[PDB]
Paper text:
In particular, one construct (UblR0RBR) that included the Ubl (residues 1–83) linked to RING0RBR (residues 144–465) showed autoinhibition similar to the wild-type protein, enhanced ubiquitination with phosphoubiquitin and the ability to ubiquitinate a potential mitochondrial substrate protein, Miro1 (Kazlauskaite et al, 2014a) (Fig1B). The crystal structure of UblR0RBR parkin was solved and refined to 1.8 Å, and comprises two molecules in the asymmetric unit. The structure has five domains: Ubl (1–76), RING0 (144–216), RING1 (228–327), IBR (328–377) and RING2 (415–465), and a repressor element (REP) (Fig1C). The largest interface in the structure is that formed between the Ubl domain and the rest of parkin, burying ∼2,150 Å2 accessible surface area (Fig2A). The primary contact is between the Ubl (β3, β5) and RING1 (helix H1) domains (Fig2A; Fig EV1). The core interface is stabilized by hydrophobic interactions mediated by I44 and V70 of the Ubl domain and L266, V269 and T270 of RING1 (Fig2A). This interaction is supported by several key salt bridges and hydrogen bonds including R42 (Ubl) with D262 at the N-terminus of helix H1 (RING1) and R6 and H68 (Ubl) with N273 and D274 at the C-terminus of helix H1. In UblR0RBR, the RING0/RING1 interface buries 730 Å2 and involves Y147, Y149, K151, Q155, V157, W183 and L187 of the RING0 domain interacting with H227, I229, A230, P247, E300, H302, R305, I306 and E309 of the RING1 domain (Figs3B and EV1). A salt bridge formed by R234 and E404 pinning the domains together is absent in the R0RBR structure, but present when the Ubl domain is attached. In the Ubl-bound structure, the side chains of H302 and E300 (and H227) are facing into the interface, while in the R0RBR structures, these residues are flipped out ∼180° away from the interface (Fig3C).
Residue numbers in the entry: 1 to 83, 144 to 353, 355 to 356, 361 to 382, 391 to 405, 414 to 465
């Protein structure tokens, strides 16, 4: 039997398998061929992962079936009881999603001298420019607006070393199951569909990579290229396109080239099949021999294999579970003062509490029950 494998490409190479071939054996074939460790490969068929112990027969794979192989090792270990509210994409040295550190400065002088009127309580407070007011303590600075910024929390960072905040990503303290895999994972990405469908980051990576391989990204005139909720919910395209950086450098670079590749294809062009040089080529409309040239092998335009004369070889190239979708919906009192023990109610999302008792006036963290400090401020200034 011949199956087609798409690995970091929109072109699927043929692989010979038998009814008794396991998915693990298929991964071993692709591992040696690509020089990539076998235990890092994931096989995806019609938007679903195929398990190592399943055979080709168990999977119901037929002649000319297209499977995706994506390089992403499964990591079981996670932190379900995490305290952090925020996530950033650290572009150096982590090169991945990490818990973030929230900081504030004066939007005028850029010093950490802005005394906020009140602490932030929501994403809008820290993402929308000039939303929060205060007074700058620096001599003669008329600064009245706060400027928030985030940094990676996994290692020290300079005051200039910012990382982009990932507003869709949240600590899964609600223990909501993933829409695709039904597992309870943390952190999760929350789609902005009406149902606020939840996806784990492992599934989100597989979703994006297979959609890059199938060239199924959606073009929005006032947005660019993006993806909606995996369930196909209306008006759910990701607007904050920096969320695609969480796929890592190799995959984000493929995403960045999507538009230029789509323009070439729209003009009757073709993308080069060779792994490494996947450039948008513009040959002569009726020419079968396509040679790679702007600024490497000569391929047959029909079968996408090395240029041959005569016939091409005979060999040539999703719905979410209803109950899983309903379960994966993100949105479906008083504490004593740590010092004077007088109970107080938290009015909003801000974790910075201040005891109203005149002899006490202790500033404390609602979550930790400790005196307010820079660590609590950076890690969980407000609830998300
Ligand atoms: Cl976040
Ligand atoms: Zn980092
Ligand atoms: Zn200032
Ligand atoms: Zn999942
Ligand atoms: Zn949805
Ligand atoms: Zn080429
Ligand atoms: Zn051919
Ligand atoms: Zn008190
Ligand atoms: Zn705290």
């Amino acid at each position: 039997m011949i199956v087609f494998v798409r690995f970091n490409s929109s072109h699927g190479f043929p692989v010979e398998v038998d009814s008794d071939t396991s998915i693990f054996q298929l991964k071993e074939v692709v591992a040696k061929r690509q020089g990539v460790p076998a235990d890092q490969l994931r096989v995806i068929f019609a938007g679903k992962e195929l398990r190592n112990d399943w055979t080709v027969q168990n999977c119901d794979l037929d002649q000319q079936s297209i499977v995706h192989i994506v390089q992403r090792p499964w990591r079981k270990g996670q932190e379900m009881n995490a305290t952090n509210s925020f996530y950033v994409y650290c572009k150096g040295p982590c090169q991945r999603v990490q818990p973030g550190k929230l900081r504030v400065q004066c939007s005028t002088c850029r010093q950490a001298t802005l005394t906020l009127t009140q602490g932030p309580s929501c994403w809008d407070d820290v993402l929308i420019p000039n939303r929060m007011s205060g007074e700058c303590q620096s001599p003669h600075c008329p600064g009245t607006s706060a400027e928030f910024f985030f940094k990676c929390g996994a290692h020290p960072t300079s005051d200039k070393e910012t990382s982009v905040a990932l507003h869709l990503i949240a600590t899964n303290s609600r223990n909501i199951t993933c829409i695709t895999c039904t597992d309870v994972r943390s952190p999760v990405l929350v789609f902005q569909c009406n149902s606020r469908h939840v996806i784990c980051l492992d599934c989100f990576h597989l979703y994006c990579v297979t959609r890059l391989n199938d060239r199924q990204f959606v073009h929005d005139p006032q947005l660019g290229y993006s993806l909606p909720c995996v369930a196909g919910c209306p008006n759910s395209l990701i607007k904050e396109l920096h969320h695609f950086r969480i796929l890592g450098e190799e995959q984000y670079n493929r995403y960045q080239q999507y538009g230029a590749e789509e323009c070439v294809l729209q003009m009757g062009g073709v993308l080069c099949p060779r792994p490494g040089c996947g450039a948008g080529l513009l040959p002569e409309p009726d020419q079968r021999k396509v040679t790679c040239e702007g600024n490497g092998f000569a391929f047959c335009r029909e079968c996408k294999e090395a240029y041959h004369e005569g016939e091409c070889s005979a060999v040539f190239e999703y719905r979410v579970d209803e109950r899983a979708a309903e379960q994966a919906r993100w949105e479906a009192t008083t504490k004593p003062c740590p010092r004077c023990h007088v109970p107080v109610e938290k009015n909003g999302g801000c974790m910075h509490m201040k005891c109203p008792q005149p002899q006490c006036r202790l500033e404390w963290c609602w979550n930790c029950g400790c005196e307010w400090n820079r660590v609590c401020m950076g890690d969980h200034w407000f609830d998300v």
